[PDB]
Amino acid sequence: KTCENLANTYRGPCFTTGSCDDHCKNKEHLRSGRCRDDFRCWCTRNC
């Protein structure tokens, strides 16, 4: 399944999933990244 937790190295509010996802893929090397309702970047990872 997918497990999802906050982006560690993303300091600040998130406004767009594309910003979060790049961060999670490119920087944190996880599955995806989503900019959720809670305004933070959550990186999705396979589990």
Question: What does this molecule look like?
Answer:
With 47 residues, the protein is of the alpha+beta class. It has a single domain, classed as Knottin, scorpion toxin-like (Defensin A-like, 2-Layer Sandwich), CATH 3.30.30. Helices cover 23% and strands 32% of the residues. It is built from one helix and three strands, in the order E-H-E-E. A three-stranded antiparallel sheet has the order 1-3-2. A hairpin with a 5-residue loop joins strand 2 (32-35) and strand 3 (41-46). The longest helix is centred in the middle third of the chain and has 11 residues, at 17-27. It starts with a strand and ends with a strand.
Give structural attributes.
about 45 residues, alpha+beta, Defensin A-like, 1 helix, plant protein, antimicrobial
Can you give me a brief rundown of this structure?
The chain is built from one helix and three strands; from the N terminus they run βαββ. It is α+β, with helices and mostly antiparallel strands and 47 residues long. The PDB classes it as plant protein.
CATH level 3 topology? Defensin A-like
Terminal CA distance? 5 Å
Please tally the helical runs, counting DSSP H or I stretches of 4 or more residues. 1
Q: State the domain count.
A: 1
CATH superfamily: Knottin, scorpion toxin-like
CATH architecture: 2-Layer Sandwich
**Sheet having the most strands:** 3 strands, antiparallel
Percent helix, as a range, is 10-25%
Class inferred from helices and paired strands: alpha+beta
Report the C-alpha radius of gyration, rounded: 9 Å
Task: Assign an overall shape.
Answer: globular
CATH top level label: Alpha Beta
**Spatial sequence of strands, sheet with the most strands:** 1-3-2
Strand residue content: 25-35%
Task: Write down the secondary-structure element order.
Answer: EHEE
Number of strands: 3
PDB class: plant protein
Keywords: antimicrobial, plant defensin, cysteine-stabilized alfa/beta motif, plant protein
Assembly: monomeric
Entry title: NMR solution structure of Vigna radiata Defensin 2 (VrD2)
